[PDB]
Amino acid sequence: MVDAFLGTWKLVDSKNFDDYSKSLGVGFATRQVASMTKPTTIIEKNGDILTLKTHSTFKNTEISFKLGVEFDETTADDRKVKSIVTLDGGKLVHLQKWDGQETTLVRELIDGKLILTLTHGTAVCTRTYEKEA
Ligand SMILES: CCCCCCCCCCCCCCCC(=O)O
């Protein structure tokens, strides 16, 4: 059941995003702009296919995928990764693999807010999104 994740979401809090992006090898200037950017994430479904848009004044991305089926992805920071998204414990878990590395993007609804936890290396970033009507 992915349905409570669907809709338009706006970033309202961020913790440790610089640590996360730095761990991925993102350069200082991009990290600087990212620290002041508040994306909008739009999650939509059509049958078995989810589409996840991330929009901002800096970078935009869009992916479409079926839960549990690997897909190719080119991330906002230009990594070419092998990805899979599943539901696990009611959380939407996105795993990216490239060059033997991994990162996870885990989304979980808590009190109506969408909490995105990003882990790479030892870095753990928590970002909070609120629903927009
Ligand atoms: C959409 C603006 C992002 C700007 C950051 C660019 C370099 C870091 C990108 C890291 C991977 C994507 C992180 C997504 C974060 C999110 O959806 O809130």
Residue ranges and CATH numbers for the domains of the chain are 1-133 (2.40.128.20)
**Which amino acid, one-letter code, is at 53?**
K
Closest residue by Cα to residue 131 from 117, 112, 116, 118: 112
Resolution (A): 1.0
CA of 6 relative to ligand 1 center, distance in Å: 19
Strand partners, 52: 43, 63
127 has binding-site annotation: yes
> Helix H segments across the chain?
17-23, 28-34
Rounded Cα–Cα distance for residues 92 and 94 (Å): 7
Task: Using DSSP, state whether 76 is helix, strand or coil.
Answer: coil
- Helices and strands, number each (H, E), in the chain: 2, 10
Contact 54, 39 (CB under 8 A): yes
Rounded Cα–Cα distance for residues 127 and 118 (Å): 8
Contact 43, 52 (CB under 8 A): yes
State how far Cα 3 lies from the chain centre: 17
- For the chain, what is the radius of gyration of the CA atoms? 14
Rounded Cα–Cα distance for residues 88 and 108 (Å): 10
CB crowding 55-74: b at 16 or more within 10 Å, else e: ebeebebebebeeeeeeebe
The CB-based long-range contact list for 64-71 (8 Å cut-off, 24+ gap) reads 67/2
Terminal Cα distance for the chain, rounded: 21
Both structure tokens of 122: 């030892």
Closest residue by Cα to residue 12 from 95, 122, 80, 111: 111
Instruction: Specify whether the backbone of 100 is left (phi greater than 0), alpha (psi in -120 to 50) or beta.
Output: left
Instruction: Give the residues surrounding ligand 1 with Cβ less than 6 Å away.
Output: 11, 21, 26, 30, 34, 37, 39, 41, 54, 56, 58-59, 75-77, 116, 127
Rounded Cα–Cα distance for residues 34 and 86 (Å): 27
